[PDB]
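Summary for the steering committee. One of the milestones for this cycle was to obtain a three-dimensional model of the protein with manganese (II) ion bound, which we needed before selecting residues for the alanine scan. The sequence and ligand used are listed below.
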Amino acid sequence: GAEPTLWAISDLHTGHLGNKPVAESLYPSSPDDWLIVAGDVAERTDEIRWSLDLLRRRFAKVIWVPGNHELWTTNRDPMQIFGRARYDYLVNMCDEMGVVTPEHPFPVWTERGGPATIVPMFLLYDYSFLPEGANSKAEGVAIAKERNVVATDEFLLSPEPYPTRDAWCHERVAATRARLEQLDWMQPTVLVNHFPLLRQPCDALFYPEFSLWCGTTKTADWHTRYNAVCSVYGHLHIPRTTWYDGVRFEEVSVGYPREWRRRKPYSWLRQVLPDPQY
Ligand SMILES: [Fe+3]
Ligand SMILES: [Mn+2]
């Protein structure tokens, strides 16, 4: 009576007043629990480090993937680093703390839930989730701008040295797909990515245009192609459990204080493995 569990959570946003207690209430159920943190830990590098240091001292293993907010460079950030350099800095930070990143070898869960390869991914988005009235990236962003639905990324998420964020996204997708092809085709995977791997969850957004900043069409079939037993994501701030083509998708976001105070959730940590039979 003390069997390990693989949990997940995302969108901690510890910099916002009121979400620091949430992060400070994250505890394991056994000394061998793993915790997936699926993006949007914080914006500033020191806040991200504080949160990840707090979590890695409680869980046996922490697997971190970046969200859009970790790649923001604000004026109040002690590290004025941008783009791929900022991502490499965050990866090196996590490595110095012992936190697993998308650049580390894929961890393998060998406890309850079967041998499952946990795949931490950094993919970003490529403006391919076009709104109904759009037929290109520029058209979609223009329609979103005229309706005042623009992501702050456009001004804070630098893609340097890449020219655009979709170029960075396509390179990330190419590399991650190359790594995914090298996996044993008969072993389940746990796909982790801040953004949803397919477009369907974005249909729950209050306004659809924002879907432009919510993923890429190049990963529409990865949950079935690579035999995923569970797909962990966040970003949308719509925490729930759904099923697509037999695969269980877990939106594990916490959100901003005024968002999750309207609800009363049963515990912050979402059980990824073993199957909770929900
Ligand atoms: Fe996000
Ligand atoms: Mn978020």
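Key point for the committee: The CA atoms of residues 63 and 166 lie 25 Å apart.
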